[PDB]
Amino acid sequence: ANLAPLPPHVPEHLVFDFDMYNPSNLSAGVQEAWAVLQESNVPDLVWTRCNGGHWIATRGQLIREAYEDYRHFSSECPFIPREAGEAYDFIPTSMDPPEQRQFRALANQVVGMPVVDKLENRIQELACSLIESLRPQGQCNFTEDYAEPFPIRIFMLLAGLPEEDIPHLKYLTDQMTRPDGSMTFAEAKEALYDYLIPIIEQRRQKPGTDAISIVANGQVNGRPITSDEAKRMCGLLLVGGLDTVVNFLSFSMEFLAKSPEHRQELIERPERIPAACEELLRRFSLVADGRILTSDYEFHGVQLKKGDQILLPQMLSGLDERENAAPMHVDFSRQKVSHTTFGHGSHLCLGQHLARREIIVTLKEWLTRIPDFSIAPGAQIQHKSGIVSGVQALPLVWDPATTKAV
Numbered sequence: 001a002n003l004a005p006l007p008p009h010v011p012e013h014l015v016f017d018f019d020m021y022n023p024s025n026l027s028a029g030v031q032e033a034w035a036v037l038q039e040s041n042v043p044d045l046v047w048t049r050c051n052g053g054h055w056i057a058t059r060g061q062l063i064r065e066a067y068e069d070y071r072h073f074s075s076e077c078p079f080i081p082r083e084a085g086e087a088y089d090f091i092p093t094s095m096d097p098p099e100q101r102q103f104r105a106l107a108n109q110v111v112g113m114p115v116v117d118k119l120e121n122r123i124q125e126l127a128c129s130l131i132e133s134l135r136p137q138g139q140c141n142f143t144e145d146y147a148e149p150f151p152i153r154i155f156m157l158l159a160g161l162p163e164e165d166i167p168h169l170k171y172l173t174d175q176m177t178r179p180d181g182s183m184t185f186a187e188a189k190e191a192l193y194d195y196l197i198p199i200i201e202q203r204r205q206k207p208g209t210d211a212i213s214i215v216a217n218g219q220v221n222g223r224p225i226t227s228d229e230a231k232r233m234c235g236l237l238l239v240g241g242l243d244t245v246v247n248f249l250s251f252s253m254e255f256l257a258k259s260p261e262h263r264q265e266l267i268e269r270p271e272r273i274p275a276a277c278e279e280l281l282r283r284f285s286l287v288a289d290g291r292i293l294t295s296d297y298e299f300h301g302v303q304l305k306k307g308d309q310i311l312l313p314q315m316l317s318g319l320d321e322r323e324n325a326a327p328m329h330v331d332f333s334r335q336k337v338s339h340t341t342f343g344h345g346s347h348l349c350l351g352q353h354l355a356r357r358e359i360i361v362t363l364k365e366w367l368t369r370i371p372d373f374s375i376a377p378g379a380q381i382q383h384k385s386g387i388v389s390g391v392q393a394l395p396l397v398w399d400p401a402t403t404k405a406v
C-alpha cells in the first residue's frame with residue numbers, strides 16, 4: 001500500500017503518514033500542503049511510513065537544532081529516500097566539518113558577496129533584456145520565459161562561458177533535474193562532466209578571473225584541487241542555482257499576480273523591495289531535504305536509531321507560527337522575518353547572496369516595466385512537491401498599453 005512496515009523502535013503515537021513527493025491537498029498550494037504537519041494535534045517530531053520510512057521534524061526549533069548538530073545528523077546523502085538522488089556526487093553536499101570547510105571557502109570565493117556586487121549591473125542588464133522582450137507581448141509563460149533563462153544566463157556570466165553553450169548546457173541540467181526519459185541521471189551527469197573537464201584543465205593552465213578558473217586553481221589539504229573535485233563542485237555551483245531560483249521566482253510572481261496591494265506597495269515604496277524579498281523567501285520557502293543519524297541518539301524525547309533518515313524541511317521553519325505570527329500571511333513590513341529558506345548550519349546555501357540579488361533585481365525591473373499583471377483567465381496554477389518544490393506553469397497576462405519601456 002506504499003507503506004513501509006513500522007520499525008520496532010518507533011512508537012505508534014508518533015506515526016503521521018506524509019508523502020513529501022505527493023502530499024494530500026497539494027491543490028491548496030504546496031506550502032499549505034506541508035503546513036498540515038504543523039496543525040495543533042501533530043507532534044514536533046513524527047515518523048512517516050511513506051517513501052521507505054523516515055522521521056520528519058515539523059517545527060523550526062528542531063529543524064535549526066538538527067542542522068547545527070552535524071555530529072549527530074550527517075549530510076552523507078541528504079536525499080530521502082537515498083534513491084531519490086541516484087548517482088549524485090556533487091561537492092560539498094556529502095561532506096561535513098572539517099573536510100567541508102575548505103571547499104565551502106573556495107566556493108564562497110567565487111559566489112560570495114564581493115562577486116555578487118561586481119556582477120549586479122550585468123545581472124540587471126540581463127533582467128531588463130528579458131522583461132523588455134516580453135513587455136510588448138502582453139503575455140508569457142513565466143517559468144519558461146523568464147524564470148528559467150535568467151539563472152542559466154547568470155551562470156554563463158559567472159563562469160565565463162559563451163552564450164552559445166546554453167542550449168546544450170541547459171538541456172543537460174534539465175535532463176538531470178527535470179528528466180523526460182531521454183537520458184538517465186548518471187548519463188546526463190557524465191555528459192555535464194564531459195563539458196566541464198576540458199574547460200577546467202584549460203583554465204588550470206591559463207587562468208582567468210571567472211568562477212571556473214578560481215575553482216580550478218584552488219588549494220585543498222595543502223595540494224592542488226583535482227580534476228575530479230573541481231568538476232564535482234562546479235557541477236553544484238551550476239545546478240544548485242537553477243531550479244531553486246526558477247521555482248522561487250515563480251511562487252513569488254504567482255503571489256504578486258494575485259495581490260494588487262503588494263504590487264502597488266513595491267511600486268510606491270521601492271526601497272522596501274529588499275525587505276519584501278526576505279518576506280517572500282519566508283512565505284514561499286521551497287526546499288526540503290534531510291540528514292542521517294550517525295549514531296543512536298535521543299532527540300527531544302524521541303529515540304533515533306543509527307542509520308535512520310530524518311527530513312528537516314527548510315520550508316517549515318518560517319511557516320511555524322511559533323517563529324512568525326500568522327505565518328501564511330505576507331507582510332513586507334514584518335520586523336522579524338524568521339526563516340531557514342537557504343538552510344541552516346554548516347551547509348547554509350553558498351549562493352544565498354547571489355539568490356537575493358536575483359530576486360531583488362527581478363522584482364524591481366519587472367514592476368518598473370510591467371506594474372499591472374494577472375494570472376491568465378481560465379488558468380489553474382498547479383504546484384509540485386519534492387526536495388525542491390515548485391510551480392508547473394505560470395501563464396501571465398497584461399495590457400501592453402499599461403506598461404513602460406525603461
Ligand code: HEM
Pocket residue numbers: 075078091092093094104107111236237238240241242244245248286287289290314341342343344346347348349350351352354355
Ligand atoms: C532562492 C534560491 C535558493 C535557495 C532557496 C537555495 C537553497 C539551498 C539550501 C536549502 C541549501 C542547503 C541544503 C542542505 O543543507 O542540505 C543550499 C545549498 C547550496 N546552494 Fe543554494 N539555494 C538557492 C540558490 C542558490 C544559488 C543561486 C546557488 C549557486 C550560485 C546555490 C548554490 C548552493 C550550493 C553550492 C550549496 C551547497 C552548500 C553546502 O553543501 O555546503 N544556491 N541551497
